[PDB]
Amino acid sequence: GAMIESSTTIQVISAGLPRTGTKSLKNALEIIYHKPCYHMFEIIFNKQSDIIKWQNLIHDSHMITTLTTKTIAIYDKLKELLDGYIATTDLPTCGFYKDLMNIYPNAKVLLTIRDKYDWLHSLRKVVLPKSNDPWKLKIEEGDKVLGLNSDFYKLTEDSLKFAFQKDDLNFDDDQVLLECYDEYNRLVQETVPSDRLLVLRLGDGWEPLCKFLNVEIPNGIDYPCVNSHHQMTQLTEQLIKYKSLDAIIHMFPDLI
Ligand SMILES: Nc1ncnc2c1ncn2[C@@H]1O[C@H](COP(=O)(O)O)[C@@H](OP(=O)(O)O)[C@H]1O
Ligand SMILES: CC(C)NC[C@H]1CCc2cc(CO)c([N+](=O)[O-])cc2N1
């Protein structure tokens, strides 16, 4: 197909929850658009100063009405955070999908989904281990190597609670999490006009995504398959062993 000059503004809003293929999708959108896509990895590796800005935004977000003066202030901060990016995926952004749709009226919406039990299992190994899981101590040790402190964990928890619209949340309760998951995904498909939504099940690959976005399938490039919990476990253990990211980053080419 012909090469056309794409606008550097949010073109795709992904509502999918963490551990549903968001990093592969991030990589895929960057392969298509040749501009950055927002993701929790963007915060961790490139923009840790954003952490307090997202935390502030979530704090102020109860005061959003579907427009109040207070809404415009929030929308302005969201636009600021996302300047220069062509898409959003993952926490903390995914819970803001309705507001992003208002801010970027010409952006299309994605929902990444998968088997709820596979999701929970993945979440417990990477994002939200149970309190008494010994692996939690390893995650915390590796996170310190990355410069991540208590504020980072607060942002993760608060952004999840925001996505699920819960004032609080027993993170150690599998049944609660499974029910939030199903309710979240249900609500997205009820809220977004079907014309503006594409639901992507893990494994779907390039084809429905590229059709939805009116772009050619990238020539000779397989759809990304990254960020497995097995790989994240290896990253954690290597961070602990070497005590720096730059010592090991050559070992994790497409993940980081
Ligand atoms: N192209 C693909 N096909 C199948 N699974 C994929 C995939 N890309 C990512 N995944 C899976 O999606 C999860 C990562 O999601 P995220 O990037 O949102 O955190 C991982 O699940 P597992 O932890 O079960 O391996 C990963 O294996
Ligand atoms: C020990 C290291 C590997 N921990 C990985 C980092 C970096 C990867 C990571 C990703 C997410 C979600 O995309 C979350 N999260 O929302 O809790 C946390 C983290 N933490």
Numbering used by the authors: -1 to 64, 68 to 257
Sentences reproduced from the published study:
The ensuing disruption of synthetic and metabolic cellular functions eventually leads to parasite death.
Previous studies have succeeded in separating the enantiomers, but have not provided information about their absolute configurations or relative antischistosomal properties. The question of which or if both enantiomers are active, and which or if both can occupy the binding pocket of SmSULT is addressed in this report.
